[PDB]
Design a protein around this ligand. Structure first.
Ligand code: UDP
Length: 433
């Protein structure tokens, strides 16, 4: 009796949170249509209860781009600057074809689809925005003019060091423009859904209240459901029979997300830090991860030994919840970070720029749930980080913080919790649009 249209950005880390939201909203009585590009499409047969519509790449034009590297997502700007007419065409089709007693309540877009705002306005259709990065991260964007007028303790941001900012915003006419339209149009939206929870980013709520005149809602989506049904790669599910053989809290999970890439100098250094830590590890290396190779070709044989295993892909949150996991070495993508937080797993942080440095520093020095490794890649430093989080008594407090943080995330979903009442408002709000 009330349908919601959800249009994600076709990259994991963007597909994952939006389909989590859609499932949650489905949990609350709404119908779901997903607008998706054919590129990077998820497995629609995992969502029998969703209707999928494929758009904007079907009859191609400027999107005959490469499918796998740092230059896909050039689709993002292209579609932003050229997709408006098709989007309006497709939305109008769907609103024609519903109704008997089925309105369309709103359109929820990834905040990167800033072109969607004027399209929805043109159809008198409320639009809601979904942020896939943190509130802290929005607090640094919407402060990127004090930074410009000007190495350690960033002025007006004691959380961060200058290294942090100068690595985060190091491509800054490259995405200056589209980062700002993004903000411009989520301010002008009818509401913003944030994938976190109030007690995770309490220090950041004031900014969001004062910068964004639309209502905000903080929902830790990974506490509602994992993102597994929206996996673009196939799960290596054999890891769990191997995890069932390990003692509790004695495996380090290692994974640098869906898009990062490292050059062989560094890939072989990470291996040795793993071996040098003498901890057991389950290492996800996406085929593509390494400069030179397809998968993990520069790796010698048995080099990991009896304690190491390597795979192309897992159901990450489910692994983070297995009792064998004692720590998570991550590139600090916001989804991974939130998943590890919601499962109570402490982290070792690396990063590849772009919100990742700020996620790492916030979890490292504010919440104190991990060790920020990046002054580079060095074996002994890597081994020291793994052991301080996993074994050292010095790091008992980080492990303890991780457990309490998860409890805070659990409590927030209970009646009178921040996340509970946030979701309750969101449903109420959408139902009156
Ligand atoms: O082997 C893997 C590696 C990662 N992921 C998921 O991929 C997403 C990556 O999102 P994130 O923001 O952390 O990283 P990004 O790829 O955007 O840098 C997370 O939900 C992970 O749980 C997964 O399911 N299996």
């Amino acid at each position: 009796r009330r349908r919601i249209i959800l249009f994600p950005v076709p990259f994991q880390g963007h597909i994952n949170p939006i389909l989590q939201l859609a499932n949650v909203l489905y949990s609350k009585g709404f119908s779901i249509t997903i607008f998706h590009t054919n590129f990077n499409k998820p497995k629609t047969s995992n969502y029998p209860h969703f209707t999928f519509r494929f758009i904007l790449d079907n009859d191609e034009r400027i999107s005959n781009l490469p499918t796998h590297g740092p230059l896909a997502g050039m689709r993002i700007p292209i579609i932003n600057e050229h997709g408006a007419d098709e989007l309006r065409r497709e939305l109008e089709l769907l609103m024609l074809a519903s109704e008997e007693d089925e309105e369309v309540s709103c359109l929820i877009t990834d905040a990167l689809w800033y072109f969607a705002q004027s399209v929805a306005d043109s159809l008198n259709l409320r639009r809601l925005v979904l942020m896939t990065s943190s509130l802290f991260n929005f607090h640094a964007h919407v402060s990127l003019p004090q930074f410009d007028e000007l190495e350690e303790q960033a002025s007006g941001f004691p959380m961060l060091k200058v290294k942090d900012i100068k690595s985060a915003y190091s491509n800054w006419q490259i995405l200056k423009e589209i980062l700002g339209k993004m903000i411009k149009q989520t301010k002008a939206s009818s509401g913003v859904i944030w994938n976190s929870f109030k007690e995770l980013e309490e220090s950041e709520l004031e900014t969001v209240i004062r910068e964004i005149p639309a209502p905000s809602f903080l929902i830790p989506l990974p506490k509602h459901l994992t993102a597994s049904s929206s996996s673009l790669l196939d799960h290596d599910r054999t890891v769990f029979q191997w995890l069932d053989q390990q003692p509790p809290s004695s495996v380090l999970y290692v994974s640098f997300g869906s898009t990062s890439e490292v050059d062989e100098k560094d890939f072989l250094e990470i291996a040795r830090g793993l071996v040098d830590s003498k901890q057991s590890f389950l290492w996800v290396v996406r085929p593509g991860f390494v400069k030179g190779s397809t998968w993990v070709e520069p790796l010698p044989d048995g080099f990991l030994g009896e304690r190491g295993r390597i795979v192309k892909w897992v159901p990450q949150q489910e692994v983070l919840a297995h009792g064998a996991i004692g720590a998570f070495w991550t590139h600090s993508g916001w989804n991974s970070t939130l998943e590890s937080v919601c499962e109570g797993v402490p982290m070792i942080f690396s990063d590849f720029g772009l919100d990742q440095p700020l996620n790492a520093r916030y979890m490292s020095d504010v919440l104190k749930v991990g060790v920020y490794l990046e002054n580079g890649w060095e074996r002994g430093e890597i081994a020291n980080a793994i052991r301080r989080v996993m074994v050292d008594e010095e790091g008992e407090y980080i492990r303890q913080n991780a457990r309490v943080l998860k409890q805070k995330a659990d409590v927030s979903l209970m009646k009178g919790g921040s996340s509970y009442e946030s979701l309750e408002s969101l449903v109420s709000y959408i139902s009156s649009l």
